[PDB]
Structure formats: structure tokens, C-alpha cells
Amino acid sequence: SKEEMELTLVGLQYSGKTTFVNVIASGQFNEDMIPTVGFNMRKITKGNVTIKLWDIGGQPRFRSMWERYCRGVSAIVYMVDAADQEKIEASKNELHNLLDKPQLQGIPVLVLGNKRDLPGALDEKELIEKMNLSAIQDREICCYSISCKEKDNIDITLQWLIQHSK
Numbered sequence: 001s002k003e004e005m006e007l008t009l010v011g012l013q014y015s016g017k018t019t020f021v022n023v024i025a026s027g028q029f030n031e032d033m034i035p036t037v038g039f040n041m042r043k044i045t046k047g048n049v050t051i052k053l054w055d056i057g058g059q060p061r062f063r064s065m066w067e068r069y070c071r072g073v074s075a076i077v078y079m080v081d082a083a084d085q086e087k088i089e090a091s092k093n094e095l096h097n098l099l100d101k102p103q104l105q106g107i108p109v110l111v112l113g114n115k116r117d118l119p120g121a122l123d124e125k126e127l128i129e130k131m132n133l134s135a136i137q138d139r140e141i142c143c144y145s146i147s148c149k150e151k152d153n154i155d156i157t158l159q160w161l162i163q164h165s166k
């Protein structure tokens, strides 16, 4: 039977949001940076499942809107550059800040430690520890190390998403 789900994709700028959307939509990786925009809604169909994906700007100027775009969705995907050690603390802070918002209560969160292909990229345990993901207790939370460039764990990411297609 047909399913329709909505996902919101947030995380700091340069974490890989737009790249990830394109890998999910087409299977193709882009090395180039598409310019950053406040929002972009795309519909991606995977067989019987239609995914309405909100790709949300991660620059400081867009972050106050993250909550509004996350409201009512099937799952929040939180993109992290697992290779950019300097930005992990800010990435962490924005995640926990976002999940303080009561209208987001209970919505499943998938944290993606992107750029696994790069030297020094954090794995699941390392990202879970550095981002204090164990502290997130009101909802289902999952973390995967992925590479949009080499495809590692794109399959399981999509599987996780479909399992939350409602």
C-alpha cells in the first residue's frame, strides 16, 4: 500500500544536507557545494513510499526556524560532518537546543555522522559520546556513520526512514 511521510533535514552548514538529498533522490554524489538556501522541499519516491523532504539552511541565520520546519514530521534527520572536529560542539548544542522545543516532543531523530570517508571521521560510538546522544530520552534516537561520497550505510539510512513512513 502507498505510504507518505515527511522528513526534515537540519544540521550545521557544510554537514552534507543537500548532498544527502541528492544521493537519496538519484544515487549520485556531488563534490560541489550547491549554494545555501533557507529551505527547499523535494518529493522523493521510493516505490510505494513518497518522502516529502525539507532541506533546511544550517547557517546561524536560519536556525531559529528549524523548529517550525520540524513540526509534525515523521522524523528529523540531523546531519553532522563527522570529520570536522571543531564544529562537533556547536552541532551538539544546536541539536539539544532543538529537542528542548515542546512541539517536537516524541518525534524520532536520526543523527547521521556524514563524511565517514574522510580521515579522522568519528564512528557511531564516538559521535554518540561527543554529542551526548545518550541524554536524549523522550524519543527514539538512532545514529549511523555514513558517507554520501562512497555510499557507506546509505542503504540502512533509507531502511530506517521507510520503517518510520507511518
Ligand SMILES: Nc1nc2c(ncn2[C@@H]2O[C@H](COP(=O)(O)OP(=O)(O)O)[C@@H](O)[C@H]2O)c(=O)[nH]1
Residues within 6 Å of the ligand: 011, 012, 013, 014, 015, 016, 017, 018, 019, 020, 030, 031, 032, 033, 034, 036, 058, 079, 114, 115, 116, 117, 118, 146, 147, 148, 149, 150
Ligand atoms: N568527503 C565527503 N564530502 C562530502 C560528503 N557529503 C557531502 N560532502 C561535501 O561536503 C560539502 C558540503 O555538502 P553540502 O551538501 O553542500 O552541505 P550542506 O550545507 O549541509 O547542505 C560539499 O562539498 C559536499 O560535496 C561525504 O560523504 N564525504
Ligand SMILES: [Mg+2]
Residues within 6 Å of the ligand: 017, 018, 019, 034, 035, 036, 037
Ligand atoms: Mg545545502
